[PDB]
Each structure stands twice: as structure tokens, then as C-alpha cells.
Amino acid sequence: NNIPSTKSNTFTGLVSLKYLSLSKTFTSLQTLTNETFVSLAHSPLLTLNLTKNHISKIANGTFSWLGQLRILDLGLNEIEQKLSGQEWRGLRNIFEIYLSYNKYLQLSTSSFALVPSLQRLMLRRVALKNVDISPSPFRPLRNLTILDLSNNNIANINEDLLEGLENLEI
RNA sequence: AAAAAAAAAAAAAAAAAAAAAAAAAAAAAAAAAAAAAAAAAUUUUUUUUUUUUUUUUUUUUUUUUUUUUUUUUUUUUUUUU
Numbered sequence A: 001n002n003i004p005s006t007k008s009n010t011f012t013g014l015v016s017l018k019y020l021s022l023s024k025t026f027t028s029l030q031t032l033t034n035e036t037f038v039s040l041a042h043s044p045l046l047t048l049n050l051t052k053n054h055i056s057k058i059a060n061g062t063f064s065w066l067g068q069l070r071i072l073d074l075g076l077n078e079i080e081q082k083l084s085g086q087e088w089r090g091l092r093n094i095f096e097i098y099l100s101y102n103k104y105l106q107l108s109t110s111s112f113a114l115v116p117s118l119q120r121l122m123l124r125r126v127a128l129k130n131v132d133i134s135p136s137p138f139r140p141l142r143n144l145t146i147l148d149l150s151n152n153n154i155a156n157i158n159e160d161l162l163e164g165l166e167n168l169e170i
Numbered sequence B: 001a002a003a004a005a006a007a008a009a010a011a012a013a014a015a016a017a018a019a020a021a022a023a024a025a026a027a028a029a030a031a032a033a034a035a036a037a038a039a040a041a042u043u044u045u046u047u048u049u050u051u052u053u054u055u056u057u058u059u060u061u062u063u064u065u066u067u068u069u070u071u072u073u074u075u076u077u078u079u080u081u
């Protein structure tokens, strides 16, 4: 679809919505703030698709109202930002992360400490850099089961990386 | 009482020529020093500009194989309008 962007009360009234797909829907969503998904405050969403939406920047607390959100898809986008952890603020019980197929995703020591209840995490084709800092960004995470960092040209990995990820299987 | 010649002692003052010394200043010659400086012969750091080797990401191009559709020119054959 070709909707420019959402409004304050676009999705207001959906008190039972749990499956939402917005793939290749928004063309004027270059920058994401915390006033986009405000309409879904009362929606117990479980799946969220946002691929091919030309997402390039998200603000702190954008998904704060998505407390019950478990599945999110931000792949196939043009994200150009520095991860700090506050981008995933408000995710009380999140299941997995879809941020593959990007061009720049810089990781920090606290980029993922806010949400430690993940299950899967793949960063395929994101060109991530500077993951040599200690402690590792994945240290707080405990229930990761699938971890993919392929097609990103990892410069270096140290001993502190992949520490304590006992639950990992793939 | 006083004045003078030969012979002998002389005490003081003003000058000088020498010897033995001693402080003071000024000249040099050697042993050191503290330095603000100067190079030269051995180690190496940081930064800028660039060379070579090696491992990989993105994009583009060539070829081969497989496969889905828009068009088809053929129809060996089958009942026919």
C-alpha cells in the first residue's frame, strides 16, 4: 500500500487486534517517533510486519505502548541509527527480533540489556561494526535460541563475546 | 758669663736607597664545577601521506544448469461444425 504515515488515532478502537501486517505500506515513514504506534496502546498485538517500509530512524520509546507485542519485523529496511537499548523500551514480553537486511546497525554494551527475554535474533546483511567492546552486548540476554550474524563481515570477536548464552542452539 | 777649632758620644725631626716578609687589587697558565646551548651515533614512539601481500562485504558483468509465465510457428493422432 501507499499510505504516507499513520496518525494519532488511525488504529484507535482495535481492542482485540493481535495480528497486524504493514509490509511495503508506508512511503513517508523515513523517521519513526514515539507518536506513530500510540493508537495501538490498547491493542494486544502479537505479530507486527513492517518490511519494505523504508524505515531509517526510530526514536526512543517508539514501541513503549507495545507491551504485549511478541513478533516484530523490521527487515528489508534502510535503518541508519545507533542502537542504545532504549529503542526497544516498553517490550515487556518480546519473543524474537527481525532486523536483518540493513546497511548500518552499530551495537553498544547496552543496546539489548533492556529486554533480556528474547528467543531468536538474526542480523543477516546489516553491516554491523564495533562489537569488540566489553562486556558483550549479548551478555544480559539469557533465552536466545537462534543467533545469526551472517553476511556482515565481522571484523573481530573476543573472548567476552557469546558469554553466558547457554540456551543458544542455532 | 760668652764665642769658637781638633777628638768623642749621641737623642729627636724631615728625607731617601736597599734586604726579609705580609695582607689587598689587577693579569695570565693549568685542575675542576653548575648550567641556558650545539651537533652525531645507536635505540625506538605518536601523527599525516602513500606502496605491496592476504581474508572477506556490497554493486556490476560473462557463461552453464534448473524452473515459472506473455507469445507462439508444428501437430503424428482423436471425436467434429
Ligand SMILES: *[C@@H]1O[C@H](CO)[C@@H](O[C@@H]2O[C@H](CO)[C@@H](O[C@@H]3O[C@H](CO)[C@@H](O)[C@H](O)[C@@H]3O)[C@H](O)[C@H]2NC(C)=O)[C@H](O)[C@H]1NC(C)=O
Pocket: A033, A034, A059, A060, A061, A062, A064
Ligand atoms: C518521544 O521522543 C521524544 C524525543 O526524544 C522525547 O522528548 C524528549 O523527552 C525527554 C524526557 O522528558 C526530554 O529530556 C528532558 O526533558 C525534561 C522535561 O521533561 C527537561 O526538564 C530536561 O531538561 C530534558 O530536556 C527531551 O528534552 C525531549 N526532547 C524532545 C525533542 O522533545 C519524548 O519524551 C518521547 N516520549 C516517550 C513517551 O518516549
Ligand SMILES: *[C@@H]1O[C@H](CO)[C@@H](O[C@@H]2O[C@H](CO)[C@@H](O[C@@H]3O[C@H](CO)[C@@H](O)[C@H](O)[C@@H]3O)[C@H](O)[C@H]2NC(C)=O)[C@H](O)[C@H]1NC(C)=O
Pocket: A021, A023, A048, A049, A050, A051, A071, A072, A073, A098
Ligand atoms: C511479512 O510479510 C512478508 C510477505 O508475506 C513475509 O515474507 C515471507 O517471509 C518468509 C520467511 O522469511 C519467507 O519464507 C522463506 O522464504 C525464503 C526465500 O526468501 C525461502 O528460501 C525459505 O525456504 C522460506 O520459504 C517467505 O517466502 C516470504 N514471503 C514473501 C512473499 O516475501 C514476512 O515473513 C512477514 N514478516 C513477518 C511475518 O514477521
Ligand SMILES: *[C@@H]1O[C@H](CO)[C@@H](O[C@@H]2O[C@H](CO)[C@@H](O[C@@H]3O[C@H](CO)[C@@H](O)[C@H](O)[C@@H]3O)[C@H](O)[C@H]2NC(C)=O)[C@H](O)[C@H]1NC(C)=O
Pocket: A059, A060, A084, A085, A086, A108, A110
Ligand atoms: C535514547 O536513549 C539513549 C540511552 O539512554 C540515549 O543515549 C544516552 O545519551 C546521553 C546524553 O548524551 C549519554 O550521556 C552522556 O554520554 C556521553 C557520551 O556521548 C558521556 O561522555 C557522558 O559522560 C554522558 O554519559 C549516554 O551515555 C547515552 N547512553 C547510551 C547508552 O548511548 C539517547 O540520547 C536517547 N535519545 C533520545 C532522543 O532520547
Ligand SMILES: *[C@@H]1O[C@H](CO)[C@@H](O[C@@H]2O[C@H](CO)[C@@H](O)[C@H](O)[C@H]2NC(C)=O)[C@H](O)[C@H]1NC(C)=O
Pocket: A116, A117, A142, A143
Ligand atoms: C527464560 O526462559 C525460562 C524457561 O522458558 C523462563 O522461565 C519460565 O517463565 C515463565 C513465565 O515467567 C513460567 O511460566 C515458566 O514456568 C518458566 N519455566 C521454567 C522452566 O522455569 C524465564 O522466565 C525466561 N527468562 C525471562 C527473563 O523471561
